[PDB]
Amino acid sequence: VKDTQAMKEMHFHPKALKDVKGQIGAPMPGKVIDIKVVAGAKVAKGQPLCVLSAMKMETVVTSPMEGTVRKVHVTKDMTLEGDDLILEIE
Amino acid sequence: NRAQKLLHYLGHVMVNGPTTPIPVKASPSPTDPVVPAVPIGPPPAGFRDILLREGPEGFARAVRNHPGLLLMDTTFRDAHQSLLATRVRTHDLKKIAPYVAHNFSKLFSMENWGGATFDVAMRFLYECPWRRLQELRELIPNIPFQMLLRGANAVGYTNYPDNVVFKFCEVAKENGMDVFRVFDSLNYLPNMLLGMEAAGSAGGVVEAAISYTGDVADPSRTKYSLQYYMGLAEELVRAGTHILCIKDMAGLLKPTACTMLVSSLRDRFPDLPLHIHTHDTSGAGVAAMLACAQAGADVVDVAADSMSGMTSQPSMGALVACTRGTPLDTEVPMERVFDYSEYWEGARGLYAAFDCTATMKSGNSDVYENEIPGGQYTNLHFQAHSMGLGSKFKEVKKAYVEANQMLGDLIKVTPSSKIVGDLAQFMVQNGLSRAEAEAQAEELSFPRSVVEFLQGYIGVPHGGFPEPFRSKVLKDLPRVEGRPGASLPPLDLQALEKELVDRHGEEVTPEDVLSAAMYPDVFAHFKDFTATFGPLDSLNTRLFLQGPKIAEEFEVELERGKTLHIKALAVSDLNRAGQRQVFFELNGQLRSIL
Amino acid sequence: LAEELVRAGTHILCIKDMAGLLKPTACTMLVSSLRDRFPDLPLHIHTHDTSGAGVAAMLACAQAGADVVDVAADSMSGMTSQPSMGALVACTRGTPLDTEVPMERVFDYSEYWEGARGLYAAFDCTATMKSGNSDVYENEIPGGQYTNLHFQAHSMGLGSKFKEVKKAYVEANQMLGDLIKV
Ligand SMILES: *C(=O)CCCC[C@@H]1SC[C@@H]2NC(=O)N[C@@H]21
Ligand SMILES: *C(=O)CCCC[C@@H]1SC[C@@H]2NC(=O)N[C@@H]21
């Protein structure tokens, strides 16, 4: 008998696919310190745009390619896990 | 309002839980360690009186001439990170202090503080290290202290201005500190000279240690041969010291390496007493230490019986018992050792929430491949757990060797394994391999600490580091050359006092100013939390650690003459807005806490 | 005793130590003494790493005259077990004794046991043995019984006062007199 009281749990958390290079994933889990790029802005090669903080770790996000961003999936001060959708660069 | 703040803190513990992250879910046992009976009289005379009556040189040749072997007990700094997570409270620590002062005088010097102790007492341990030294000065007026400092960057993990180091060193020596230890992560001589001259400027015994890495008896081992050690030793001795020491975190000193190194070093310095520091990780540390003692050893670091082995130092009992019918003649009674070990065996179970032997569980041979520091293994385990790689703990350390090979075979102790630890953690977190991480090292975002290391803020390695990798990572970033501290802009800490006073400071002492200038944000964390919840490190370690139940009457001696008996009479439920109420009984007073 | 045994007629002679009380001095003196009038018969030593410095004593015995050595796997060593593979294999590299056994294979052999020991969670040294204890000289307790002794005492229900049970052992020994217990 298929149970109707399963109540499948909803979690969002946009996962970043490895095949797509424009999609950006978190190298480590942690909390975003700050974001350096607002939506619809221009990004450069080898330029920092986001910083991650852990218990005793800090990571700064380096832009993968050249272009413009479309949207910022992460806004500010959130618990981020590794390799999830945060920004896209075009 | 202090008692009310304490009751609020205890209730918050009971309903919510301990604030510090608990690595392993274990409940501390209700077994009170036995405090040994101590003599009434004053502590005997050791070697502190000799140094007080003389200069550093007097203490130096007093050590050198003495017939016998000198004991470095490390049951207060080394054993913590060697076994636990350097996660011990001070309250129970002042329970053998009269016993150590009174029974133990043949002891050379004691390892009170540490940089790790300072960091943990500013981050997680809600205590003040300057106090930690201050109340401990008056409990043992017999034996000199020994504290682990380093050359370029005194207490933090990145380089710091020279004047700042000058002021820490002078203030620390002022507090009553006795012996200064100085080293550097690399073999960078200017850092060593800076630390030596700081230790001298404070005024006192300046002891030099150097890291030992690789096999010095293997003919194949060519990067770190005997001559490289010898030349560096000659540099250090011309620099100007009092006692010469060896740093061995991984404990890779074989008996043959022992004897050859000791004979070679003593061969042309039969004047400097020698200090040896090692960890019993391979399991054969005791025989190597015996050979070192036979050859030329002067100061031998030995651990307490119940916090020994595993990743720790050799125990008291084996060293004392073997050296019975020999001229070496440690000449230290072992009956006291038995009770001291019994006290530590009781006290160790108090901290079971974070115990490496849950994962460690055995001797762990096959470290020559890993070459993992003894004082960093459990810390890496904890951080991997916190990030969430605790399940793949074996895999994380499988990636340490490859990161070491990426930046090459270099000496790794404090800011030299943690960066490679970050490298291995990244390696497993992205679940990738070495050669391609080398290949795509341009776009792949790398941890910032690794970038700072490649910048050379730590210094220049003895063997260098690969050019394509530094080119692909550093890319277009400005690079600091030579000794960064010399070009580093010295910072001023006077405005620190004014800013602290105008923000939350009302009686800040210069030592607190130093602590804030060293680690500001976490200092604010400490102070503004201790302002709300009241004065901590006044209650029993076990009582806070469990604090799990009601109708338990426990007394907290915040001040003498104030028992502050606390009886958790009952605990209520949710009234209207997710706020509960608890019943406490004071010494004679009922309090209803929310 | 040894001369009587050799007059009886054997093939190999063995020295047993449950508690691991061969000091390096006692090691070398005893081994040389036995080897003095018999540099032909095979000699064996079997001890337990109970005190903690058993590796040093075993090395001394090997250097003097030892022939056969009892050594356990790394994950089943220490505490009150026998000396580990790793120490003996590693120390005898630039040494004429030359154990000469692939240490890489011993590594995996040890790892198997490190993994496998976790199944028997019921049967272990546990909290009675967080660290290798000394005062074995004062206890005179065979290392082969400590686990069975604790199991039996807990079976009666003396696990709580397991401490007093073992510090009663030495008075028991002297009440019967200093005799060898195996
Ligand atoms: C943070 O939680 C405290 C520091 C943990 C790292 C410690 S410091 C001293 C040891 N050396 C090392 O690399 N890790 C250990
Ligand atoms: C009963 O529980 C099993 C036999 C108990 C005796 C064993 S024999 C080997 C050990 N050594 C000792 O003295 N007792 C143990």
Curated annotation (Swiss-Prot), chain A:
Domain (Biotinyl-binding): residue spans on this chain: 21-90
Subcellular localization(s) per the UniProt record: Mitochondrion matrix
Residues modified to N6-biotinyllysine: K56
Source taxon at top rank: Eukaryota
Residues found modified as N6-acetyllysine: K2, K36
Quaternary structure and partners: Homotetramer. Interacts (via the biotin carboxylation domain) with SIRT4.
Implicated disorder: Pyruvate carboxylase deficiency: Leads to lactic acidosis, intellectual disability and death. It occurs in three forms: mild or type A, severe neonatal or type B, and a very mild lacticacidemia.
Known function: Pyruvate carboxylase catalyzes a 2-step reaction, involving the ATP-dependent carboxylation of the covalently attached biotin in the first step and the transfer of the carboxyl group to pyruvate in the second. Catalyzes in a tissue specific manner, the initial reactions of glucose (liver, kidney) and lipid (adipose tissue, liver, brain) synthesis from pyruvate.
Protein name: Pyruvate carboxylase, mitochondrial
Organism field: Homo sapiens
Gene giving rise to this polypeptide: PC
Portion of the full-length sequence here: 1089 to 1178 of 1178
Swiss-Prot record, chain C:
N6-acetyllysine: residues carrying this PTM: K23, K167
Residues that coordinate or bind Mn(2+): K16, H46, H48
Tree of life domain: Eukaryota
Post-translational modification: Acetylation of Lys-23 might play a role in catalytic activity regulation.
Compartments in which it is found: Mitochondrion matrix
Chain positions found as N6-carboxylysine: K16
Subunit structure: Homotetramer. Interacts (via the biotin carboxylation domain) with SIRT4.
Clinical condition linked: Pyruvate carboxylase deficiency: Leads to lactic acidosis, intellectual disability and death. It occurs in three forms: mild or type A, severe neonatal or type B, and a very mild lacticacidemia.
Function description: Pyruvate carboxylase catalyzes a 2-step reaction, involving the ATP-dependent carboxylation of the covalently attached biotin in the first step and the transfer of the carboxyl group to pyruvate in the second. Catalyzes in a tissue specific manner, the initial reactions of glucose (liver, kidney) and lipid (adipose tissue, liver, brain) synthesis from pyruvate.
Name the UniProt record assigns to this protein: Pyruvate carboxylase, mitochondrial
